[PDB]
């Protein structure tokens, strides 16, 4: 459900999104309801910090080797929801 | 009965609800200490 | 030697559909469920007594 969006050759550790703060879900709650990367939706190049809800550039984005978008899922137990990312890389 | 306590003033009326399985309702309420037989006869119900 | 053995079969969540809820018509001691379902669905009844 979330678009987001980064530019060409990114570095580690660089801010993309914040996931919390978009979704409206409570910060301090995340690790009592299990903030966690779905298994499957998983990139090579894009990690989020599971504390604070942030999503940040875990590897450096190769426009040429990607591709087309990148596509991660979140899931949260108790209440048991999954959401999804969407994030473009520019040329 | 569906409720416990009453709220009683003086020389009034007040009303109580119930559930029974007989078809007759030959039972005793107790308000507030002392004893009282009551008399009735029920329907079976409509729905199933 | 020893190897990893990757891709580790973990715990996540997924969605199942819900099916059509029924249409119950009630005689005396039973009920009749009008049930539609254009895959299998399982439907499983039990008493709720001693047996």
């Known amino acids: ?91 | 009965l569906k409720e416990a306590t009453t709220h009683v003033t003086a020389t009034g009326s007040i009303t109580l609800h119930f559930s029974t399985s007989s078809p007759q309702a030959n039972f005793i309420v107790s308000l507030c200490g002392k004893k009282t037989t009551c008399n009735a006869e029920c329907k079976p119900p409509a729905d199933h | 030697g020893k190897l990893h053995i990757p891709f580790r079969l973990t715990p996540t969540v997924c969605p199942v559909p819900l099916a059509h809820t029924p249409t119950v018509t009630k005689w005396f001691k039973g009920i009749t469920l009008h049930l539609t379902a254009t895959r299998p669905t399982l439907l499983t009844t039990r008493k709720l007594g001693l047996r």
């Open chain 1, 1 to 91: 459900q979330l678009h987001y969006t980064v530019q060409e050759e990114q570095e580690h550790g660089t801010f993309v999104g914040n996931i919390a703060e978009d979704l409206g879900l409570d910060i301090t709650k995340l690790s009592a309801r299990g903030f966690q990367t779905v298994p499957n939706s998983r990139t090579p190049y894009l990690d989020l910090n599971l504390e604070t809800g942030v999503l940040y550039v875990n590897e450096k984005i190769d426009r040429e080797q990607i591709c087309c978008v990148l596509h991660l899922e979140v899931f949260l137990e108790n209440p048991l929801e999954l959401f999804q990312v969407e994030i473009e890389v520019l040329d």
